[PDB]
């Protein structure tokens, strides 16, 4: 089933100048970027986005890092995109991340782990609707 | 000095699945993407954007190609960005584009040449304002 | 129950210069505008928006009118907002519209009837998501 | 002649439920709303917007008030719009605002005065570009 999932290139990814390399990782794996927008999140936006985790000890630090610089918001489309996205990102902890994943190659630490990806189809629908209107998502054919 | 210019990845660039390769081409040469937005242009948006070419013979075709699918709009910031961007893109005609340029590597024809770049600083300011609010452009420091 | 519904001031409403009067009709009735954006719809956008009616004879004319000029997109919030919105708009046919409604006071004809409103809660969710990201909708208190 | 200026309905205007009354005030005087967007400004957006007032004593407060809730951003188009808009708004201090002006009717205090209007054409161009892409501004004819 063709699904859509949210991907966010965190502040450290832009600072390292690897936006293109990250997008290429998805493209080469068949995850088609159908929505992309560079944006600098406000505290209200980050908090609203991570609301279900407001009780976790990491919450506050997470929010501050996510608003410390601009991020690149994206919607990836493909067969089993939600899971495929998580595979390509790799384990949350870079030291524990598999070979060839984004976090293994680009992440700094568990706290500065370069990318975000929806954890489930259920959440993907919410995360996407949070950052994009349906009119901002555009599929296109892959050819040549 | 540091300038900001508009770059657009045309419909064919997305279809070829080389959005990342193109962006990397800029990043690796010091042209920082400070604004990015995937969008599908309407005919009125394309016509307004290429207004300066309204009298040119290729206009109608350019407009049709530019609205045939979505594009990636970008604002690149860097030293001598307007010229630098154009150099990296390569000659309009892929047939005569230099080695290592975006067009030589990805363009298929003159009419479907993968990228657009503002031709001058003055036009850059106009092209940028056409697609981006100042609040949509964000500079950030590199490592 | 506090609900959110989509309202669109059609091209004829802007041409008559009654944007403010229309918004006032909602405000005075407790329907709070929590999202507003003036936009000129493309044919693709209008068609996608009215897709479920693509088989109806009115479809094509509807789409052309809806793209003939800019419109004002809005999300109204309030108790039973979906139904309240429909009450305030009035019958689709202005000649059949009740006293004090938007269509009775401002509409030209059944074809140029000034406003659009979600028909149900189910559709409101879809119409809103089509034109607005959740981050573009902002509730605020009514005071003074 | 015809000009375009920026108008912002401050947080208190929305809280009072007079968005429509304010808009009607402009429409009825020939100032056509050609761009409208409800938005909640972040501190960085408010600070950047009021940069020219960074040294003024009211700056900090202005910024806090402007981000306390959402605002309605608008671009008004019409004959002598920059001055016309300012006239309709009325004096900054509601206490001395003229009869029939927006501030006399709706403003509660100098610091919560319901509306903002570009003070000059040059600043109008900058304020407009700060919040709107040219593609977000749409003129239309009246009846």
From Swiss-Prot, chains A, C:
SUPFAM superfamilies per record: Nucleoside diphosphate kinase, NDK
PROSITE patterns linked to this entry: NDPK, NDPK_LIKE
Active site annotation, chain numbering: 116
Subcellular location: Cytoplasm
One function term, GO molecular function aspect: metal ion binding
Coiled coil: none
Catalytic activity reported: a 2'-deoxyribonucleoside 5'-diphosphate + ATP = a 2'-deoxyribonucleoside 5'-triphosphate + ADP; a ribonucleoside 5'-diphosphate + ATP = a ribonucleoside 5'-triphosphate + ADP
Keywords in alphabetical order: ATP-binding, Cytoplasm, Kinase, Magnesium, Metal-binding, Nucleotide metabolism, Nucleotide-binding, Phosphoprotein, Transferase
GO cellular component terms listed in the entry, alphabetical order: cytoplasm
Pfam families registered for this protein in UniProt: NDK
UniProt entry tagged with the keyword Nucleotide-binding: yes
Co-factor requirement: Mg(2+)
CDD domains, per database record: NDPk_I (cd04413)
EC number: 2.7.4.6
Protein's GO biological process: CTP biosynthetic process; GTP biosynthetic process; UTP biosynthetic process
Keyword ATP-binding set for record: yes
Residues that hold ATP according to the record: 10, 58, 86, 92, 103, 113
Quaternary structure and partners: Homotetramer.
Family: Belongs to the NDK family.
Classification via HAMAP family: NDP_kinase (MF_00451)
Role played: Major role in the synthesis of nucleoside triphosphates other than ATP. The ATP gamma phosphate is transferred to the NDP beta phosphate via a ping-pong mechanism, using a phosphorylated active-site intermediate.
NCBIfam families according to UniProt: PRK00668.1
Protein name in UniProt: Nucleoside diphosphate kinase
The species this protein was found in: Myxococcus xanthus
GN (gene name): ndk
From Swiss-Prot, chains B, D:
Protein name per UniProt: Nucleoside diphosphate kinase
Cofactor(s) it depends on: Mg(2+)
Superkingdom of the organism of origin: Bacteria
MF (Gene Ontology): ATP binding; metal ion binding; nucleoside diphosphate kinase activity
Stated family: Belongs to the NDK family.
Protein localization: Cytoplasm
Chief location: cytoplasm
Residues that hold ATP according to the record: 10, 58, 86, 92, 103, 113
Any one Gene Ontology cellular component term annotated for this protein: cytoplasm
PANTHER family, per the entry: NUCLEOSIDE DIPHOSPHATE KINASE
Keywords carried by this UniProt record: ATP-binding, Cytoplasm, Kinase, Magnesium, Metal-binding, Nucleotide metabolism, Nucleotide-binding, Phosphoprotein, Transferase
Catalytic activity field: a 2'-deoxyribonucleoside 5'-diphosphate + ATP = a 2'-deoxyribonucleoside 5'-triphosphate + ADP; a ribonucleoside 5'-diphosphate + ATP = a ribonucleoside 5'-triphosphate + ADP
Subunit structure comment from the entry: Homotetramer.
Catalytic residues, chain numbering: 116
Entry EC number(s): 2.7.4.6
EC supergroup of this enzyme: transferase
Role played: Major role in the synthesis of nucleoside triphosphates other than ATP. The ATP gamma phosphate is transferred to the NDP beta phosphate via a ping-pong mechanism, using a phosphorylated active-site intermediate.
GO biological process: CTP biosynthetic process; GTP biosynthetic process; UTP biosynthetic process
């Amino acid at each position: 089933a063709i699904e859509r999932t949210l991907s966010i290139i965190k502040p450290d990814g832009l600072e390292k100048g690897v936006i293109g390399k990250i997008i290429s990782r998805f493209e080469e794996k068949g995850l088609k970027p159908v929505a992309i927008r560079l944006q600098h999140l406000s505290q209200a936006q980050a908090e609203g986005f991570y609301a279900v985790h407001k009780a976790r000890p990491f919450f506050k630090d997470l929010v501050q890092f996510m608003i410390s610089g601009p991020v690149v918001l994206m919607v990836l489309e493909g067969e089993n995109a939600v899971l495929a996205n998580r595979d390509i990102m790799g384990a949350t902890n870079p030291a524990q991340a598999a070979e060839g994943t984004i976090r293994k190659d680009f992440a700094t630490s568990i706290d500065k782990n370069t990318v975000h990806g929806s954890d489930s189809l259920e959440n993907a629908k919410i995360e996407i609707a949070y950052f994009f209107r349906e009119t901002e998502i555009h599929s296109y054919p892959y050819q040549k």
